[PDB]
Symmetry: none
Subunit: 124 residues, 4 copies
């Protein structure tokens, strides 16, 4: 894994995630417009951090898009809207064959996300 995309229309969340991610994965990019992110072809070395964006469901469209195109990228779902809903999206996305490797509720637990991202990197 060598690149991270952050997909969230919340500017302050995108900044926070960039700051946590960049020391670990230097190649990180945030999108606040999912439509722009959906023009990229991703590969197996990409990690996507995706907010579900409820109750508008732009995140649900992103998951449908990635499933339709059989994306090989690793996916982390986040949401502050409702955790039963977050866990449902994870279940649905896995069952459609996407590689969801984790989920986090907002407000984000930054220590847990830090440990988890470190372990995905190739440090010793």
């Amino acid at each position: 894994l060598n690149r991270v995309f952050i997909v969230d229309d919340d500017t302050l969340t995108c900044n926070l995630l960039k700051t946590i991610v960049e020391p670990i994965f230097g190649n990180v990019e945030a999108f606040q417009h999912p439509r722009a992110f959906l023009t990229l072809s991703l590969n197996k070395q990409d990690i996507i951090i995706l907010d579900l964006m409820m109750p508008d469901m732009d995140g649900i469209e992103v998951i449908r898009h990635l499933a339709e195109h059989k994306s090989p990228a690793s996916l982390i779902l986040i949401s502050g809207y409702d955790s039963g809903v977050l866990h449902s999206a994870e279940t649905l996305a896995l069952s459609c064959g996407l590689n969801v490797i984790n989920t986090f509720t907002k407000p984000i637990n930054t220590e847990v996300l830090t440990c988890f991202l470190t372990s995905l990197s190739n440090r010793q």
Copy 2:
């Protein structure tokens, strides 16, 4: 009753099975093997939609997303494998988006339970 029932399922066999169970009870039943064609329709409060989730594709999820964005008032029934929570996940997602999910059924379908449910549904119209 005479409510419209729309069956949405791209599998011809399970689609036809649903149709044979519904038609003696709700004669105005129409089956769509192509979800996107179904999505051009605008539905009423009295319409009943039987939606196969069509796992492991995301076509069922797209119909839910479309229905929720247009705030469909129609009653919704979801069908799929129990699948360690897949049907419950879709139901939770759909209820959360403001959709009126009135029941779910695991596949393969218990036709006795479905016949019994649609019968009571008809009688309370």
Copy 3:
């Protein structure tokens, strides 16, 4: 399946369930004290309708008891407290090897429960 037990400290729920159940399974008994129900040895032909009884968790104790004793009975969980919690209890109880055949949120959907119980009976 030939006997139904209803386990719920809510008297009005117990009455409602008895009235729905008895036309279908004549041998039905309700307990408002779980401790009394836990003195019975159940068999494979028993159906238990159990409220989780949150936030006190008497229902959780009933599930632990039935798991410890490897009860063969069929189990239906109900709760008006929180449906993510209801679905968690179902998941936990199945994974401990109990035969959970359904769950219902309160207020109970009486048409759905009626259809479901009918299908468990031996009518044609």
Copy 4:
């Protein structure tokens, strides 16, 4: 730090593994292979409990039930297979009963992630 850590897991091997990961970081660590003995203890706000769910028995669920009934103030970490939602179910149950679940870990355990987490946990004491 010098918080007490209690490891509750009746499997001697996975128990010992947890213990070897915790002890360099929290020296005051005690492992219980018998949940009921652990349940005689009264815990403080600063205690950390690492609880194996011990599926497919219900011993982990009983510790959660006991802790919640006595309103334990201790921090709780839950360990188990992802198991199509089993760990998430226990976490949801425990949070709902008012317990302070600070993290969960799937088995088999990623010792790097656990070492990293307990290190930050120690540093924020």
